[PDB]
Paper text:
Rotation is driven by a flagellar motor, which is a supercomplex containing multiple rings. The C-ring (C = cytoplasmic), which contains multiple copies of protein subunits called [name], [name] and [name], switches the rotation of the flagellum between counterclockwise (CCW) and clockwise (CW). The switch is also the site of torque generation for the flagellum, through an electrostatic interaction with a stator called MotA/B4. The switch also connects to the MS-ring (MS = membrane–supramembrane), which transmits both the direction and the speed of rotation to the flagellar rod.
To inform on this pose, we determined the 4.6 Å resolution structure of switch particles containing the extreme CW-biased [name]ΔPAA mutation. Symmetry expansion followed by local refinement gave superior results to particle subtraction. FliGD3–FliMmid undergoes smaller positional changes, rotating approximately 25° as a unit with a slight adjustment in the binding interface. Comparison of the CCW and CW poses suggests a mechanism for switching in the switchΔPAA mutant. Finally, the PAA motif in FliGD3 normally interacts with the first helix of FliMmid, which is held under tension in the CCW pose. Removing this interaction allows [name] to rotate.
Numbering used by the authors:
A (entry chain G): 3 to 168, 172 to 324
B (entry chain M): 44 to 324
C (entry chain N): 53 to 137
D (entry chain F): 514 to 560
E (entry chain Q): 57 to 137
F (entry chain P): 55 to 137
Write the structure that this text describes.
């Protein structure tokens, strides 16, 4: 199978260099870079694949019977002789900005609410109120939710005061905030990637790191520990997920993990099982003797990896 | 030690007309008529102006060719807040105050529109009398970073303005070094003059026609000998004082020499025979 | 106080005569033009310092060298009379 | 076997290049059928 | 063309009265002149004027901020004054 | 004293410096030149180009007023001219 990108990439090579440059101009620079890397790394079409991409493009061309030109100039020239160039350029810019500002509105709705809020946190409360009004009511609420109480209250107060409904400047405001995203990147800054490394590190090493960060900042340490939280107590993970783990992990591995686990952990991991299964697990735990903690920790790490995979699949929430 | 004094006439009218131009510009920009109250022109050292400057506030550099040096303008955070919310149509009855926090990108952009509008307004207002191009150089946050003047004690001229839009108020200043206007120090003192048409010069020529009818008293000098007041005290009537040969006579009116001349005996009178007019060119 | 001032250099001036004359007349004047003065020939010349009236005198050629011989010291009353013209 | 496969590859390349010239000529004579299919391409890429 | 050192002169204001006004004023008596605070100062050489310029102090040492050569136009009026 | 009421011209100077014309040649119209007398020393006071005394200026009554401090002191005058 050939992915949709690869078919498009092969078509981009096939359509010619001048057409490819025109498409690059008509499209996004990230797409231009992706196509350039693809045509540099390796060609995406084989003889069967080239046949498939060319055939599907042909079926697209049959269906896209344009009987028309892009006329980004030719259409205007026909309009200009009939009515004059002036009464079209401004209205056209306004229409494009309306398409552009709606595109930005949808993009902000799709992208993460707290990221949008912090991108707009420094901005004007009037800006926040008007963008909230323009956004979807789910999205507007999501940006509003994160804000501090005072800023949020000022935002709702200014929502009513926003009666000017201003129009070219709003589009330029969206343009200004748009140009800041490509520099933002980030990803490395967020604590959770650092927190995952702490889980990956050697037990005593992350214990020492936890002590050191508690000395550095107790609040930050508590936040990272809350990020740590994975089946250390019943309420955070819930009895249904406790049942889910036991039916998805080997019983011997679960018992070996429970050897070093707390008695509340054993109780929470035995309540879900039936009477027979709970009795078998308890008898096995009682009969099995002491084992070197390295194997217990390795099996616990494997079990927690299974838990993380389940959370990534998203069957149930943890925390 | 640094002292300067003067009195100004023309720049007051210049500021008033520029303020009217700026008021109408802001009216058309924000679809709402503002009001600008020009404060009394301030003359103070640079350090005094910096101390009086309310930090935080945005300062901007606008060069004035061909005169060496850069002009300075400032705008209050209250003014930028009110202007930007009016641009958004906000009432402004729930205002916010930001201190130390640098202006965002959008806020700096709105400041850029105010900067360009003010630059255009002052350009037209100033060129209405004297053509001096104004070109923005660089905005600044802290006054110490502006460091326009050679010394903090350097005396500078500042023009304050009080700008309001309905209930919303505000104040911004335009401050200039005195060295910026030192070459034009005589011009700014002089009030603006109209006309200057072709009939204005022959009007000056008309004044010249009046001037030919003038009365002048000459002074004739023979000897200017340096002596001592002790000798003067011991001098008595009948005393004689030798004098070198006066090869020529200098003629001056109230001090200013005009010509040289030779004495002569004419019709029983002390007459002088002029040689030539003294032309210092 | 008086002794301190005595050894001080000072300037002096002497004037010949005065005539009313306007810029028309001076522009009309050319090289070699002769202009008279109210001072009659043989009249003693007024002697002043820094524009301040001092005395009057006349020039006498003693040992083929020009020299002004004073004749009087202006009284305050006569000075007032002279300035009241 | 191998020679037959090589000849098949050669004739397939010839057909592919002439039919790609067909794409070139139709795209030259009608740009509208190009932009919409590019939109479909990016739709497939992001989908 | 050939060079030689020469004596300069700077003058801080001039007035017109008899010394007895100041002779009566004993030591420690302050007296003002036509010189005020702000106007530039002139420079003389051997008693012959050159140019106009303020004077400042740097490193506890006076420094003249000369401006431009005095033209005969203003030279005549300052001689008259 | 019959000539007591005679106005006189006074001269007040800052300081001197032996200055060759090659220096003024490189001295621009906006150059800075120092002197011999240190800052804070009372200015010399002269009349008609003749040494009289010394004094210092003070900012009093919005006008530069010089405070007379010394007398002619002919011995000191001879010492001064003997430089």
């Amino acid at each position: 199978n050939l992915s949709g990108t690869d078919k498009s990439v092969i078509l981009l090579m096939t359509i010619g260099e001048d057409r490819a440059a025109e498409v690059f101009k008509h499209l996004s620079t990230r797409e231009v870079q992706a196509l350039s890397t693809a045509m540099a790394n390796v060609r995406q079409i084989s003889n069967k694949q080239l046949t498939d991409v060319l055939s599907e493009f042909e079926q697209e061309a049959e269906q896209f019977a344009a009987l028309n030109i892009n006329a980004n100039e030719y259409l205007r020239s026909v309009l200009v002789k009939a009515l004059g160039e002036e009464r079209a350029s401004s209205l056209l810019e306004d229409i494009l900005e309306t398409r552009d500002t709606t595109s930005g509105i949808e993009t902000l709705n799709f992208m993460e609410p707290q990221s949008a809020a912090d991108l707009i946190r420094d901005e004007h409360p009037q800006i926040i109120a008007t963008i909230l009004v323009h956004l979807k009511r789910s999205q507007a609420a999501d940006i509003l939710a994160l804000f501090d109480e005072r800023l949020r209250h000022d935002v709702m107060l200014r929502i009513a005061t926003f009666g000017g409904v201003q129009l070219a400047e709003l589009t330029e405001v969206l343009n200004g905030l748009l140009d800041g995203q490509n520099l933002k990147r980030s990803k490395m800054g967020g604590v959770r990637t650092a927190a995952e490394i702490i889980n990956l590190m050697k037990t005593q090493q992350e214990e020492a790191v936890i002590t050191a960060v508690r000395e550095f900042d107790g609040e930050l340490a508590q936040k990272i520990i809350d990020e740590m939280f994975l089946f250390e107590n019943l309420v955070d993970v819930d009895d249904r997920s406790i049942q889910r783990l036991l039916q998805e992990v080997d019983s011997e591995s679960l018992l070996i993990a429970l050897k070093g686990a707390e008695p509340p952990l054993r109780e929470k991991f035995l309540r879900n099982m039936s009477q027979r299964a709970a009795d078998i697990l308890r008898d096995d735990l009682a009969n099995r003797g002491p084992v070197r903690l390295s194997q217990v920790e390795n099996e616990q790490k494997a079990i927690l990896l299974i838990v993380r995979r389940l959370a990534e699949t998203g069957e149930m929430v943890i925390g | 030690r640094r002292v300067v004094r003067e009195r100004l006439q023309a720049l007051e009218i210049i500021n008033e007309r520029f303020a009217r131009q700026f008021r109408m510009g802001l009216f058309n920009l924000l679809r709402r008529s503002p009001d600008i109250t020009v404060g009394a022109i301030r003359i103070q050292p640079y350090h005094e102006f910096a101390r009086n400057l309310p930090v935080p506030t945005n300062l901007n550099l606008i060069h004035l060719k061909p005169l060496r040096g850069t002009g300075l303008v400032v705008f209050s955070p209250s003014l930028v807040f009110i202007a930007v919310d009016n641009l958004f149509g906000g009432d402004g009855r729930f205002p916010t105050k930001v201190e130390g926090r640098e202006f965002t990108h959008t806020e700096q952009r709105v400041i850029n529109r105010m900067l360009k509008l003010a630059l255009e307004g002052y350009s037209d207002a100033w060129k209405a009398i004297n053509p001096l191009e104004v070109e923005y150089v660089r905005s600044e946050m802290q006054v110490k970073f502006t460091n326009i003047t050679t010394s903090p004690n350097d005396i500078v001229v500042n023009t304050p303005f009080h700008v309001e839009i309905g209930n919303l108020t505000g104040e911004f200043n335009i401050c200039l070094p005195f060295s910026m206007i030192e070459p034009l120090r005589e011009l700014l003192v002089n009030p603006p003059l109209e006309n200057s048409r072709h009939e204005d010069q022959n009007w000056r020529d008309n004044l010249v026609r009046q001037v030919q009818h003038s009365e002048l008293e000459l002074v004739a000098n023979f000897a200017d000998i340096p002596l001592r007041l002790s000798q003067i005290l011991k001098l008595k009537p009948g005393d004689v004082l030798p004098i070198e040969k006066p090869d020529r006579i200098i003629a001056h009116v109230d001090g200013v020499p005009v010509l040289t001349s030779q004495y002569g005996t004419v019709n029983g009178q002390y007459a002088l025979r002029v040689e030539h007019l003294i032309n210092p060119i | 106080d008086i002794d301190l001032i005595m050894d001080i250099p000072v300037k002096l001036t002497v004037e010949l005569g005065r005539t009313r004359m306007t810029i028309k007349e001076l522009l009309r004047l050319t090289q070699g033009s002769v202009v008279a003065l109210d001072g009659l020939a043989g009249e003693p010349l007024d002697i002043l310092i820094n524009g301040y009236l001092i005395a009057q005198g006349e020039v006498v050629v003693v040992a083929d060298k020009y020299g002004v011989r004073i004749t009087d010291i202006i009284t305050p009353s006569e000075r007032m009379r002279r300035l009241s013209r | 076997k191998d020679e037959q496969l090589q000849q098949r590859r050669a004739n397939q390349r010839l057909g592919a290049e002439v039919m790609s010239q067909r794409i070139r000529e139709m795209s030259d004579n009608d740009p509208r059928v190009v932009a919409l299919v590019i939109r479909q391409w990016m739709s497939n890429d992001h989908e």
